[PDB]
Motif scaffolding. Sequence first.
Motif, short mmCIF file in Angstrom:
data_model
loop_
_atom_site.label_atom_id
_atom_site.label_comp_id
_atom_site.label_asym_id
_atom_site.label_seq_id
_atom_site.Cartn_x
_atom_site.Cartn_y
_atom_site.Cartn_z
N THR A 67 -12.30 -42.47 72.80
CA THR A 67 -12.18 -43.90 73.04
C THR A 67 -11.96 -44.71 71.77
O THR A 67 -11.30 -45.75 71.80
CB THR A 67 -13.41 -44.46 73.80
N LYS A 68 -12.48 -44.24 70.64
CA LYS A 68 -12.32 -44.95 69.38
C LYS A 68 -10.88 -44.93 68.86
O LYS A 68 -10.54 -45.67 67.93
CB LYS A 68 -13.25 -44.36 68.31
N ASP B 225 -14.80 -37.29 73.19
CA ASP B 225 -14.76 -38.73 73.36
C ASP B 225 -13.72 -39.27 72.38
O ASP B 225 -13.94 -39.25 71.17
CB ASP B 225 -16.13 -39.33 73.04
N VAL C 142 -10.69 -38.83 78.20
CA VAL C 142 -11.06 -39.84 77.20
C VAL C 142 -12.54 -39.77 76.82
O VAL C 142 -12.92 -40.19 75.73
CB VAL C 142 -10.72 -41.27 77.69
N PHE C 143 -13.37 -39.23 77.72
CA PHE C 143 -14.81 -39.07 77.47
C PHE C 143 -15.48 -38.38 78.65
O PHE C 143 -15.01 -38.48 79.78
CB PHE C 143 -15.47 -40.44 77.22
N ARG D 222 -9.26 -50.58 74.16
CA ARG D 222 -10.51 -49.89 73.88
C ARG D 222 -11.65 -50.51 74.70
O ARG D 222 -12.48 -49.78 75.26
CB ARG D 222 -10.84 -49.99 72.38
N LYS E 54 -16.23 -47.38 81.30
CA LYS E 54 -17.19 -46.32 80.99
C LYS E 54 -18.56 -46.84 81.43
O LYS E 54 -19.32 -46.13 82.09
CB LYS E 54 -17.21 -46.02 79.48
N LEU F 117 -11.70 -49.30 78.39
CA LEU F 117 -12.32 -47.99 78.55
C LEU F 117 -13.84 -48.02 78.47
O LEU F 117 -14.53 -47.41 79.29
CB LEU F 117 -11.80 -47.02 77.47
N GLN F 118 -14.36 -48.72 77.46
CA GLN F 118 -15.80 -48.82 77.28
C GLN F 118 -16.41 -49.59 78.44
O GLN F 118 -17.51 -49.28 78.89
CB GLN F 118 -16.11 -49.52 75.95
#
Length: 194
Positions: free
Chosen positions: A94-95, A92, A30-31, A185, A192, A188-189
């Motif tokens: 994630t968006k 990445d 994912v990133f 989302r 992250k 994840l952020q």
Amino acid sequence: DLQKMVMGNTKPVELNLDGKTVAICCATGVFGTAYLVPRHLFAEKYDKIMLDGRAMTDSDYRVFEFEIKVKGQDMLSDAALMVLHRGNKVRDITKHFRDTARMKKGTPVVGVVNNADVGRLIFSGEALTYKDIVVTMPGLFAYKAATRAGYAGGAVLAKDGADTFIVGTHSAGGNGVGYCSCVSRSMLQKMKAH
């Protein structure tokens, strides 16, 4: 377009004990060097795990869990995040995840798989029920589809209207139906950030 992009982030995983492969699955990057993987498999210990043919031990990465508050008992997501200390960084994506989406029953669903059993493959089906990811099926989304043991960890894409996004990762299924663990989302952020 979205499928190809995701497929490029998906890698085969093999979990080993006593020099024997006890299970396989997919890892969806994912990133950076972080991948969404099946928690039920990664909650256990292995002498060794192969990621896209790369031999690693649990000292080569860390796994994080997500827990969401719900009526009476909180839910521990079957989607975990494995972060490698070293490795080639993935795109990445994630968006392409969402925080609020709604899927109607019967709408198209696509699973992205890359494992040792079937190689690189996509499975398609349809949402088994109406679903609202919600900023009674907490963290889960069901669908009709032909799935096999080993597709866990693979990304599931759905339709939020004419918009296609990544719902989460396949967790399990059999005899024509299955479900994935929804990953928002913000989740994840947030992880992250952690």
